[PDB]
Design a protein around this ligand. Structure first.
Ligand SMILES: *[C@@H](O)CNC(=O)OC(C)(C)C
Ligand code: NA
Ligand code: NA
Length: 220
């Protein structure tokens, strides 16, 4: 596979968004992955509505601001036959009744693909598909204050994830400890967090923070 990949350079990735004080991380991860696959299909980058997923994808198993799963969101889009644009169905950071309107749908999918729970399989998927939805353990103060560098948290769990994010690539940089490899991860806490809203997560350090344990993407 390539040693470095950055799907932002190829135009697959919208700007960083902010979920606010709602547990909708899973909706931002899913829109990010579908935004990439729709651009790969059509050549158009269109920002998609998280509020649409928060309000409407409960029948697929999601729970609004109390959590959800990207795969449940991809299933909703398939079941529903559409997903509205971000401009048409803006984000309010609170759960409300479903207001989906197919006239303003700009995306679709036909299911999704779950990646084997190995970082090597995640690398192959990032290298060949585009941005991938992933779940991580972000429940540590170090993750809140992250500014730059390769994030490594020794108390991070590989099994108990609490936050959905989006792998847009991977790469490397020389470090003190010679643990030089990272996943390039888009968060949804605004661009003031981390590095313009991105974080470099330690790669090939034993599935650090669980980044390869629930990885998937939508099929378009
Ligand atoms: C993020 O706002 C809420 N966390 C969440 O839904 O975690 C997973 C279920 C692990 C995606
Ligand atoms: Na919070
Ligand atoms: Na279903």
């Amino acid at each position: 596979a390539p040693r470095s990949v950055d799907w932002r350079e190829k135009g697959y990735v919208t700007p960083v968004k902010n979920q606010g004080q709602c547990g909708s991380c899973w909706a931002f991860s899913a829109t990010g992955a579908l935004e990439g696959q729709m651009f790969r299909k059509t050549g158009r980058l269109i920002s998609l509505s998280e509020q649409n997923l928060v309000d409407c994808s409960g029948p697929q198993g999601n729970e609004g601001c109390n959590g959800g799963l990207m795969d449940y969101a991809f299933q909703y889009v398939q079941d529903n036959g559409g997903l509205d644009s971000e401009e048409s169905y803006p984000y309010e950071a609170t759960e409300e009744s479903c207001k989906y309107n197919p006239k303003y749908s700009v995306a679709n999918d036909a299911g999704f693909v779950d990646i084997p729970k190995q970082e090597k399989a995640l690398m192959k998927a990032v290298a060949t598909v585009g941005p991938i939805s992933v779940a991580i353990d972000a429940g540590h103060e170090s993750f809140l204050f992250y500014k730059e560098g390769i994030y490594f948290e020794p108390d991070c769990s590989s099994e108990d994830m609490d936050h959905g994010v989006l792998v847009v690539g991977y790469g490397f940089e020389s470090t003190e400890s010679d643990n030089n490899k990272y996943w390039l991860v888009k968060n949804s806490w605004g661009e003031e967090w981390g590095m313009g809203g991105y974080v470099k997560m330690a790669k090939d350090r034993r599935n650090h923070c669980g980044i390869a344990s629930a990885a998937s993407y939508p099929t378009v």
